[PDB]
């Protein structure tokens, strides 16, 4: 408000109002409604008097030696104002009014009193008449909305000069309303006095504030008085010197002998839980130069393999009806056979809701939802510690393979505009080097496999809510020669996908071809049911198995799996950060040196002969594989580890810099790290990596 | 300065013909900086006898100091596909115009 | 606003016989010729046809008293023979910015008896060697070509 | 016709009638925010889900009549589902491509000018020049810079008044019609966007995007311009710098320096007066920088210069708490201080009185070519870290901090007499006298300061007294910093009390900008400054005198003409022509004046010779005790800076040329104004049926100079209106009624 | 060595409009800096001054 008051009203009227309040001991800042009211009153008075002159005779003119026709009474002090009023009353022999008229008009020799209201002029004029009656003082009452009134319907001004003040009042109203101030200003008026904003804590809210105080006090007023009369008397130092000396930080040194290997859990070996087979995945390929249809290529690839035997169960599920999985595979084979008999690749195949397939998709569980009336009579009611499982070598093997090259170009990225910026050429060179060094890694194959499968399953889930649509598991390479290649890994049979929120789960069954005999590592495939189907010649006849399991997914997981290209981004970001750091250090571009010299090597692996180094290409590949596995095996445990392990890693690195790192409680930090290593393969492998890093760095 | 005080028709500079393969704004600002520098000489006491201009981006770019290619040993720029013998071929033939005859 | 309009706009309800200085610049030409003016203009002594797209002065009116004509910024490429007969008393001509490209094009002006200035700026004829000397020999009555008399002494003001 | 039916049916039910009757037009935007729904968390997932199904995108119920339900292959372009509750029919994205391919063409000539703020970027990059990439270790300070080139230096509030006048002419408000500020941009845009059918709301948004400035506090490492910050991603990197140059057009920051010059002159001539406040306020409300009233400029620009700061403070405007010393502004981050004027002796045993700043405080010393952080106690330069470009800027910052270090070592190390005077020959602040005394050389002061060892912490090159690098030895408390020193992101605007002597103290009592540290230079402004007082004209020299005289004559052309044609004697002796007569040679004021006067009489005798330009040109020479001589002058002389300029009676000249094909007059290059060889209305009351039905803001164009009509002003209310007689401004007339009482 | 180039910016005054022979000024960036009054045949005409 006050800011607007200063903005619109000129400093002259501002200072006149300042002295006006000072005469009555009113703060120009605590009171602001009255400040604005006084400024408006003074400005309207001056604009009323101004632009009017009296000739030698009794007539009005507008603009050198003539009187103003108007004497200012408001702009002066109280004593000076009464002095002028008395002087003019004596000179003209007109009784002085008890109140103080704000202006005097010589032409009619009348005391003109102005009043600007913010409500209907009717009430203001009636109140002013009641206050002042039977005196020859002429009341002129204005409004901010354009209204205007005067005694006897007489307005002692020309129309154009009664307009030049109504116009400014209207403009002030507009400018004070666009700032949200007009509404407050209006309600500030009562009678003729401008009350100030008041906010009173009374009633329940005062009996609920005389209870929200420190223990000693018993009312908000007493506490506020205490705080107002509070002077720092060294109270803080008076309690620092009497608090028990046990309370303290007690920095304990962090020496190279301090680190302790993380205690990984104990129990049964951990079993895989990824959506799709990672390394034990067969791949029925075709050299299709394809219609862009899933079922087209799926049928072609299926026909490509000759040797399909009668399916046999090799390892049961131990908690499932294995015959149902067997008949599910048989039904899928039969249904694929049917499409050969006409229907010309219907472009979409809905399975049949048979008992076996319905059971395999989780359907028919639907535990009842009863009310408490029955519950109070039954004798069994409850909701569990998750079992802790130790570390097995299979996860490390999976990673070792996922960090390897292959004979393909798995990622085909889009186009970029031409390069004109000398920095754009450098960026393109660096990006091309990275893509060349990483376009073949099996981690990129997992990126594709996952994103394609999730995209297809999302489209199927949205399209056919209530059909068990058969979703192949296709991917597309670009063979070393250059000829495009298509690949089938398995079949997925979606379930009822009536997804309402973002966490509703759609259950599906995945059947993935493989050559790895399930009986080599019986603990990996504990959630799987595995069949034997056909023998593949390679020349020896190795049995080909099928790995059937009933998993479940939701929309959030789907969009999460559609970002392994963001994983690619993270890997490139790290590599480019290292290159930029070295380039800044050496004052030139080390992209070519990094990616071609092959002499620089970073320690990435740990063979029996100590840390084994690897060129930059292997660094890029291993970082991408790490990011991809983060995206695959994501869970709360992994994030918790990452966090506390980052704290401990930072402490260790600080030690390696001879910065003399300290710690206030390290046992707590170790317990925090170890509370999140329970039954996750990826987390336990990361813990083993961390232990090896501790053993090799600090020693 | 005693010559540029002879002209009172200075207006706001306006580009009427761009270079069309160059740096127009920094040609404009170099003039708008020459005027300012000449004004500063007038305000100072005595003629410096040599006015070194403030080294600013405008002058650096207009002078070409920020366009000249940087020297690099051949070992580093082997892979860059744009390397070519300097003045490989640019005898662009241009026909006669009358402006030289008028000159 | 083409000529016919602005002429009347500049007529200002004042009869053509009582105009002594008419200004018509940037307005238009019908196609390439002056249209709108008429011979009833008899008191005119200053006509300014500046920037009016004008390809010739073939249909110019007959102005006995004209003394200050200026056709700068137009595209006249000849046909100046008319100005001689139609403006016998012309004594200040301003052919600057036109498309004149030869001294021959200025031959017709030789027969104007009272000529005192001929501004010929930005005309392809001004790129010749011995340009001013050739003009001053083709138009002997001239005493100011482009602004200077004969020794590059600026023409005195108050003309 | 349908909208009124909608309103009628809304009012039929007596529950929305309360909302539609009791909610004043003011309380409509707070009703507009009672939306329903839950918006949408995770919109990317929802989009990926929607595009899987068909008919994702809603369109108004018009496609039905201009888009077939099936293309030439039998694919349903649009459906009939009425998304949620609305008339919008659902549509498949095939409809978008069908429109883009087999759709109604159009002519797009209004797009490259409505969206100027983007095509400018396109045409600025298309002409940019590239340089070699330099891989030097980049240092990136954190400057706050403009990120909207060509913003037209408008605020965020007058831009709204421009929009309402270009896109919504029939909804303009009282604050605009009853005004006299038309602006120039609002006359260009109104002409350009004369037939645009694009999207009134979108046109408004684009205009307010183009006509506003913004800042971002970005890690800049060079350039700092308004155009170099849009291409920051292309020019600079963590380890590279790609030298680049936008090839468009720049802004001329001349209004700000003109404002600075005007503020300086006004403050001088107001403090040398009896009542500084009245002079300051009257000049601000009356003086104009290039036509614009100085009050609008002061309320519009963010320029931060001493004189402008005092001008704003005297007008009750918030001013930055930072104080500017030696060209660097010092933002306090912590601590308290007291001026405490005390006495000291200089190196030459000269008595001196300096405000010993008592109290420990830390400052950010941000500057044009350097930055620093300086924490100091009373007479104790505790620490000073500096950074910038080259060692010259570093030395400048170091010496500025050293001068404002409160250490008596500088005082006792003085070499010479600390008697410094400025262009006005005034007693400058002794600390400031020290500042200029040491600004040139401080070698002996550096030796007195000495050098101490440094431990090479993190990498911080030390500075030797010779202003050279040193990794072990560095000046006392001066630690040149690598990797740059970041500036601040805030100014902490506050209101500061102003004493009667142009010293801007504060509620705490520390001087921020003394009036003596303002006469840095008195160069010539590029724009024109016009004053409403005849006395002020003789301040900036003959050029200003002539320009102001001619501009004043232009301002009051009708009064000058009527008085010249009716009462010439009174006109020929006014006060405004006394400054002009100071220039005219003494021995020719009479002979000239008579020649003009007689000539002026010739215009009154014979009709048709009333030439406005000639009269305006020759009038100022009339004011004199005219003599008589047969001499018929061709040009009248004037004295300008000791040189004799000439004004031509018949024609144009450098001192005066009124350009034809336009109404603009120029004097000595300086622009004078326009010479002729909507708005301005006044409210009178509410609806009055005696004047008939209400009008629209457009129809008010058809009114006389005093006719009264009632119009629908703004969004809603109808107010009786009338055109104004007499200028009716807020110039000195308002001040007279207010300053007279202040006696 | 006396063959190294010292780049310099040259800024000439002139009255010749660029647009008359735009092919002659391929290497220049031509501005408009002033308005010079020149003594023509009819009076005194203002013509632009280019840089």
Curated annotation (Swiss-Prot), chain C:
Keywords: Acetylation, Chaperone, Cytoplasm, Host-virus interaction, Leucine-rich repeat, Nucleus, Phosphoprotein, Repeat. The modification N6-acetyllysine is found at residue 86. Some glutamate residues are glycylated by TTLL8. This modification occurs exclusively on glutamate residues and results in a glycine chain on the gamma-carboxyl group. GO terms for molecular function: histone binding; RNA polymerase binding. One of its GO terms (cellular component) is nucleoplasm. Disulfide bonds: none annotated. Expressed in heart, lung, pancreas, prostate and in spleen, thymus and placenta. One of its GO terms (biological process) is negative regulation of apoptotic process. Multifunctional protein that is involved in the regulation of many processes including cell proliferation, apoptosis, cell cycle progression or transcription. Regulates the proliferation of neuronal stem cells, differentiation of leukemic cells and progression from G1 to S phase of the cell cycle. As negative regulator of caspase-3-dependent apoptosis, may act as an antagonist of ANP32A in regulating tissue homeostasis. Exhibits histone chaperone properties, able to recruit histones to certain promoters, thus regulating the transcription of specific genes. (Microbial infection) Plays an essential role in influenza A and B viral genome replication. Also plays a role in foamy virus mRNA export from the nucleus to the cytoplasm. This is Acidic leucine-rich nuclear phosphoprotein 32 family member B. The gene is ANP32B. The chain holds residues 1 to 159 of 251 of the full protein.
């Amino acid at each position: 408000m006050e800011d607007f008051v200063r903005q619109c009203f000129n400093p002259m009227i501002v200072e006149l109002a300042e002295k006006a309040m000072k005469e009555y001991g009113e703060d120009p800042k605590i009171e602001t409604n009255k400040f604005a009211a006084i400024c408006t009153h003074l400005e309207v008075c001056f604009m009323y008097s101004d632009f009017h002159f009296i000739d030698e005779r009794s007539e009005s003119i507008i603009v050198a030696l003539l009187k103003h026709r108007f004497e200012i009474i408001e702009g002066r002090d109280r004593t000076m104002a009464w002095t002028v009023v008395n002087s003019i009353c004596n000179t003209t022999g007109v009784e002085k009014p008890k109140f103080l008229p704000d202006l005097y008009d010589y032409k009619e020799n009348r005391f003109i009193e102005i009043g600007v209201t913010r409500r209907e002029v009717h009430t203001y004029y009636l109140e002013k008449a009641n206050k002042i009656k039977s005196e020859k003082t002429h009341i002129h009452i204005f409004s901010f909305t354009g209204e205007e009134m005067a005694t006897k319907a007489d307005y002692t001004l020309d129309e154009e000069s009664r307009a030049r003040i109504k116009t400014r009042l209207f403009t002030i109203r507009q400018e004070m309303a666009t700032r949200g101030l007009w509404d407050s200003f209006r309600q500030s008026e009562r009678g003729e006095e401008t009350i100030e904003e008041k906010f009173e804590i009374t009633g329940t809210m005062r009996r609920l504030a005389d209870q929200s105080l420190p223990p000693n006090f018993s009312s908000l007023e007493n506490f506020r008085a205490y705080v107002d009369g509070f002077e720092p008397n060294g109270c803080i130092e008076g309690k620092l010197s009497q608090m028990s000396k046990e309370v303290n930080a007690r920095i304990e040194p962090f020496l190279k002998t301090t680190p302790r290997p993380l205690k990984l859990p104990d129990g049964p070996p951990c079993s895989q839980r990824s959506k799709f087979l990672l390394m034990d995945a067969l791949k029925l390929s075709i050299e299709d130069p394809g219609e862009g249809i899933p079922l087209y290529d799926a049928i072609k690839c299926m026909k490509t393999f000759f040797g399909w035997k009668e399916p046999n169960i090799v390892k049961p599920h131990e908690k499932g009806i294995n015959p149902n999985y067997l008949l599910t595979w048989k039904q899928v084979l039969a249904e694929l056979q049917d499409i050969e008999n006409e229907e010309k690749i219907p472009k979409t195949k809905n399975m049949k809701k048979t008992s076996q397939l319905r059971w395999a998709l989780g359907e028919n569980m639907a535990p009842e939802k009863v009310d408490f009336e029955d519950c109070k009579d039954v004798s069994d009611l409850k909701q569990d510690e998750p079992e802790s499982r130790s570390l097995a070598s299979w996860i490390q093997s999976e990673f070792n393979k996922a960090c390897e090259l292959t004979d393909s170009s798995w990622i085909e990225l889009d186009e970029i505009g031409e390069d004109v910026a000398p920095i754009e050429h450098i960026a393109s060179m660096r990006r091309n080097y990275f893509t060349a060094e990483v376009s073949h890694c099996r981690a990129t194959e997992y990126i594709m496999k996952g994103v394609y499968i999730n995209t297809a399953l999302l489209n199927a889930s949205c399209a056919a809510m209530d059909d068990f649509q058969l979703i192949p598991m296709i991917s597309k390479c670009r063979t070393k020669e250059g000829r495009r290649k298509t690949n089938l890994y398995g079949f997925i049979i979606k379930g009822r996908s009536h997804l309402r929120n973002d966490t509703d789960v759609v259950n599906f069954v995945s059947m993935e071809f493989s050559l790895t005999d399930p009986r080599l590592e019986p603990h990996k495939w504990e959630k799987y049911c595995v069949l034997e189907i056909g023998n593949m010649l390679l020349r020896v006849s190795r049995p080909m198995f099928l790995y059937v399991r009933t998993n479940g997914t939701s929309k959030i997981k789907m969009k999460w799996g559609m970002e392994m290209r963001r994983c690619l981004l993270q890997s490139l970001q790290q590599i480019e950060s290292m290159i930029e750091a070295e380039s800044s250090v050496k004052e030139k571009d080390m992209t070519k040196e990094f990616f071609e010299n092959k002499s620089e090597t970073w320690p990435i692996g740990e063979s029996p002969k100590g840390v084994e180094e690897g060129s930059i290409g292997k660094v890029c590949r291993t970082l991408l594989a790490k990011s991809v596995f983060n995206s695959l095996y994501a869970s709360s445990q992994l994030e918790g580890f990452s966090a506390e392990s980052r704290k401990l890693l930072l402490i260790a690195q600080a030690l390696r810099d001879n910065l003399e790192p300290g710690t206030f409680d390290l046992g707590g930090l170790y317990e925090a790290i170890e509370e999140c290593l329970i039954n996750d393969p990826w987390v336990l492998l990361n813990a083993s990596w961390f232990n090896s890093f501790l053993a090799h760095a600090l020693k | 300065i005693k010559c540029m005080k002879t002209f009172f028709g200075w207006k706001e500079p306006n580009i009427v013909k761009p270079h069309e393969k160059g740096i127009n704004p920094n040609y404009l600002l170099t003039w708008k900086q020459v005027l300012a520098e000449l004004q500063d000489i007038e305000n100072e006491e005595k003629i410096p006898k040599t006015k070194n201009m403030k080294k600013t981006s405008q002058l650096r770019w207009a002078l070409g100091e920020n366009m000249a290619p940087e020297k690099v040993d051949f070992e580093d720029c082997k892979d860059v596909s744009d390397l070519k013998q300097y003045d490989s071929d640019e005898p662009e033939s241009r026909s006669l115009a009358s402006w030289i005859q008028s000159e | 606003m083409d000529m016919k309009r602005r002429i009347h706009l500049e007529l200002r309800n004042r009869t053509p016989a009582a105009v002594r200085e008419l200004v018509l610049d940037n307005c238009k030409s019908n196609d390439g010729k002056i249209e709108g003016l008429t011979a009833e203009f008899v008191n005119l002594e200053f006509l300014s046809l500046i920037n009016v797209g004008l390809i010739s002065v073939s249909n110019l009116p007959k102005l006995p008293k004209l003394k200050k004509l200026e056709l700068s910024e137009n595209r006249i490429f000849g046909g100046l023979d008319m100005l001689a007969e139609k403006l016998p008393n012309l004594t200040h001509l301003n052919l600057s910015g036109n498309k004149l490209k030869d001294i021959s094009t200025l031959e017709p002006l030789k027969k104007l008896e009272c000529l005192k200035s001929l501004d010929l700026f930005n005309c392809e004829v001004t790129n010749l060697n011995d340009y001013r000397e050739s003009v001053f020999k083709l138009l002997p009555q001239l005493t100011y070509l482009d602004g200077y008399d004969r020794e590059d002494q600026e023409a005195p003001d108050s003309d | 016709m349908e909208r009124i039916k909608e309103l009628r049916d809304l009012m039929s039910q007596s529950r929305t009638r309360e909302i539609l009757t009791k909610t004043t037009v003011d309380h409509m935007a707070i009703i507009k925010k009672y939306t329903s729904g839950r918006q949408e968390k995770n919109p990317a997932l929802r989009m990926k889900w929607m595009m899987a199904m068909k008919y994702p995108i809603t369109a108004d119920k018009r496609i039905i009549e201009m888009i077939p339900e099936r293309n030439e292959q039998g694919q349903t372009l649009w459906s009939k589902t009425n998304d949620a509750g609305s008339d919008r029919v659902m549509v498949s994205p095939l409809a978008v491509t069908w429109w883009n391919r087999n759709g109604p063409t159009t002519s797009t000539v209004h797009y490259p000018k409505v969206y100027k703020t983007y095509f400018e970027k396109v045409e600025r990059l298309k002409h940019g020049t590239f340089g070699p990439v330099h891989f030097r270790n980049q240092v990136k300070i954190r400057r706050r810079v403009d990120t909207n080139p060509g913003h037209a230096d408008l605020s965020a509030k007058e831009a709204q008044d421009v929009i309402m006048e270009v896109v919504f002419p029939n909804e303009v408000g009282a604050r605009i019609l009853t005004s006299e500020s038309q602006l120039t941009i609002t006359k260009e845009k109104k002409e350009e966007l004369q037939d645009c059918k694009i999207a009134p709301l979108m046109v408004a948004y684009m205009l307010e995007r183009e006509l506003v400035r913004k800042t971002r506090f970005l890690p800049v490492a060079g350039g700092t311009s308004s155009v170099y910050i849009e291409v920051l991603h292309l020019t600079q990197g963590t380890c590279w710098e790609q030298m680049y140059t936008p090839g468009g057009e720049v802004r001329n920051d001349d209004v700000d320096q003109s404002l600075i010059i005007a503020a300086r002159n006004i403050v001088r001539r107001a403090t040398v007066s009896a009542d500084p406040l009245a002079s300051l306020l009257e000049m601000c409300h009356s003086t104009q920088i290039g036509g614009i009233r100085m009050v609008d400029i002061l309320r519009q620009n963010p320029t931060e210069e001493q004189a402008v700061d005092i001008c704003k403070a005297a007008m009750g405007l918030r001013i930055s708490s930072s104080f500017s010393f030696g060209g660097f502004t010092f933002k306090r981050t912590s601590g308290s201080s007291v001026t405490k004027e005390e006495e000291v002796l200089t190196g030459n045993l000269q008595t001196l009185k300096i405000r010993v700043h008592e109290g420990y405080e830390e400052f950010t010393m941000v500057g044009q070519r350097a930055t620093a952080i300086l924490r100091k106690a009373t007479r104790r330069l505790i620490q000073l870290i500096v950074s910038g470009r080259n060692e010259q800027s570093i030395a400048e910052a170091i010496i500025v901090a050293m001068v404002f270090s409160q250490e008596d070592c500088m005082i006792k190390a003085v070499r010479g007499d600390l008697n410094f005077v400025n262009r006005a020959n005034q007693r400058l602040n002794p600390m400031h006298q020290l500042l200029r005394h040491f600004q040139k050389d401080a070698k002996v002061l550096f030796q007195n300061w000495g050098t101490e060892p440094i431990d090479n912490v993190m990498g911080m090159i030390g500075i030797l007294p010779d202003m050279t690098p040193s990794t072990e030895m560095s000046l006392r408390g001066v630690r040149v910093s690598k990797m740059g020193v970041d500036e601040y992101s805030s100014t902490e605007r506050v209101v500061v009390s102003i004493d009667r002597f142009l010293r801007v103290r504060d509620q705490r009592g520390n001087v921020l900008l003394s009036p003596e540290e303002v006469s840095e230079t008195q160069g010539t402004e590029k724009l024109t400054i016009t004053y409403s007082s005849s006395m002020m004209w003789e301040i900036n020299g003959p050029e200003s005198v002539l320009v102001n005289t001619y501009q004043w004559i232009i301002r009051n052309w009708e009064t000058v003409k009527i008085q010249w044609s009716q009462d010439p004697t009174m006109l020929y002796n006014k006060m405004e022509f006394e400054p002009f007569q100071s220039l005219v040679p003494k021995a020719a004021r009479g002979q000239y004046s008579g020649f003009v006067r007689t000539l002026f009489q010739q215009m009154r005798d014979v009709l048709g010779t009333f030439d406005t330009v000639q009269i305006i040109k020759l009038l100022p020479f009339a004011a004199a005790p005219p003599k008589q001589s047969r001499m018929q002058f061709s040009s009248l002389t004037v004295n300008v800076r000791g040189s004799g300029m000439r004004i031509l009676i018949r024609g144009n000249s450098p001192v005066f040329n009124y350009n034809k094909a336009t109404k603009r007059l120029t004097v000595l290059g300086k622009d004078a104004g326009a010479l002729t060889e909507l708005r301005g209305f006044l409210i009178l009351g509410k609806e009055d049926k005696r004047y008939g039905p209400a009008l629209s803001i457009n129809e008010l164009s058809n009114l006389a100079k005093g006719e009264k009509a009632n119009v629908l002003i703004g969004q809603g209310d109808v107010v009786l209106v009338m055109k104004r007689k007499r200028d009716s401004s807020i110039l000195t007339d308002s001040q007279t009624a207010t300053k007279r009482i202040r006696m | 060595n006396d063959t190294d180039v010292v780049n310099f910016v040259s800024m000439e005054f002139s009255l010749t409009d660029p647009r008359l022979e735009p092919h002659k000024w391929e290497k220049y960036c031509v501005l408009e800096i002033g308005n010079m009054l020149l003594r023509t045949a009819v009076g005194r005409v203002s013509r632009p001054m280019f840089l």
